[PDB]
From Swiss-Prot, chains A, B:
Active site: 174
Site residues, Important for substrate binding and specificity: 22, 66, 70, 117, 139
Assembly description: Homodimer.
EC number from the UniProt entry: 3.1.13.-
Residues holding Mg(2+) 2: 16, 18, 174, 179
Chain's role: Trims short 3' overhangs of a variety of RNA species, leaving a one or two nucleotide 3' overhang. Responsible for the end-turnover of tRNA: specifically removes the terminal AMP residue from uncharged tRNA (tRNA-C-C-A). Also appears to be involved in tRNA biosynthesis, especially in strains lacking other exoribonucleases.
Organism annotation: Escherichia coli (strain K12)
Domain of life: Bacteria
GO biological process: cellular response to UV; DNA damage response; DNA replication proofreading; regulatory ncRNA 3'-end processing; rRNA 3'-end processing; tRNA 3'-end processing
Name of the protein described by the UniProt record: Ribonuclease T
Effect noted on mutating residue 139 to A: Abolishes enzyme activity
Record family assignment: Belongs to the RNase T family.
Additional record remark: Member of the DEDD group of RNAses that are characterized by the presence of four acidic residues in the active site. These residues are conserved even when the proteins have highly divergent sequences.
Disruption phenotype: Required for optimal growth. Significantly slowed cell growth, increased expression of sodB reporter construct.
């Protein structure tokens, strides 16, 4: 009934990013949000700690005009309260390590929509920031697109949330923080629904 | 009860590759297997067409010694009956386009274990061979590692299969074809058990 029991010791952390393009290596990271999860005594999954950052483009980063036009982010706006990739990831990693120890997990696994995209950006930024002891698994992810495909027959984030009976505000779709929260609620609903229907734990199906 | 209804028109195709390294851009593709799926009249998911190929390293490809030591593949063995990336992929795409039309789907989505690895290798090979009208979604995947995490609380392919009550022969784990077949049966069991427990169709839960 514990978080550490659910995903063979993986500590699920919901992540979303906004970027200045499609290339994790060369394009700027502009926003990152992180939501750790927790289980109550009965084994139900829910959001724990929420973090969010506007991120300053790393020195030398490319900025694709089309990307900025898509997400509407203006990196030059001095009122956007941006912090360095180091500061943002250091805080996230700190909170994540604490949660891993507190819960008895071995490692964090990124939960994200079309996870590889977000994974690649977060890892690249960690690299650039020279962050030590990255708590995240270097290639494993929990893709909510795939999960929503199974659970809800939909792979588009907004449609998946709607089908799950969730609200989804289109005007907030370009906010890493907003997407991370919706994605976290979506993921939790999927996991919890599975349990509720007697899919977990494995013994339940025989009423045990 | 139609396959085209299950994943918003996505035609799921199970794929596994064997490679000569971790870099999809620079390292050789050595094996690839493909298994299309079908749904019967009652909406149960099962393997359809099975393809498998030994693949000749592309001209200029790197071969990591450690990788060849891992998978046991000798690209220089003339008796391995290899074919070009073009031949293999052109054949897979042909079958995939055929299944998509027959079933009324829009697009193929790759099903694979830790899917982005396989996805990136297949896509790079597709580009190298200059194949037109790649039927696969350019970034969406159904990662069975994540799905097994949800359904079975296991992310390792071999363990996930065993937990699902499937046999898994370790001596065969380095064959793309073997892995693809086990992954296909795993994916089907996961989708099907979801259905049987009343998780799908969405309407089912209120009919008890
Ligand atoms: Co051979
Ligand atoms: Mg996003
Ligand atoms: Mg493999």
């Amino acid at each position: 009934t514990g978080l550490c029991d659910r995903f063979r010791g993986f500590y699920p952390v919901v992540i979303d990013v906004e970027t200045a393009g499609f290339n994790a290596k060369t394009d700027a990271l502009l926003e990152i949000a992180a939501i750790t999860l927790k289980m109550d005594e009965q084994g139900w999954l829910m959001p724990d700690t929420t973090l969010h950052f506007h991120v300053e483009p790393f020195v030398g980063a490319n900025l694709q005009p089309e990307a900025l036009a898509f997400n509407g982010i203006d990196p030059n706006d001095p009122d956007r309260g941006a912090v360095s990739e180091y500061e943002a990831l250091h805080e996230i990693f700190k909170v994540v390590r604490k949660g891993i120890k507190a819960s008895g997990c071995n490692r964090a696994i990124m939960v994200a929509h079309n996870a590889n995209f977000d994974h690649s950006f977060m890892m690249a930024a960690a690299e650039r920031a020279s962050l030590k002891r990255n708590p995240f698994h270097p290639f494993a992810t929990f893709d909510t697109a795939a999960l929503a495909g199974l659970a809800l027959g939909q792979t588009v984030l907004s449609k998946a949330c709607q089908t799950a009976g969730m609200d989804f505000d289109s005007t907030q779709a370009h906010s890493a923080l907003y997407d991370t929260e919706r994605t976290a609620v979506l993921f939790c609903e999927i996991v919890n629904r599975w349990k509720r229907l007697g899919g977990w734990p494995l013994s339940a199906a025989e009423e045990v």
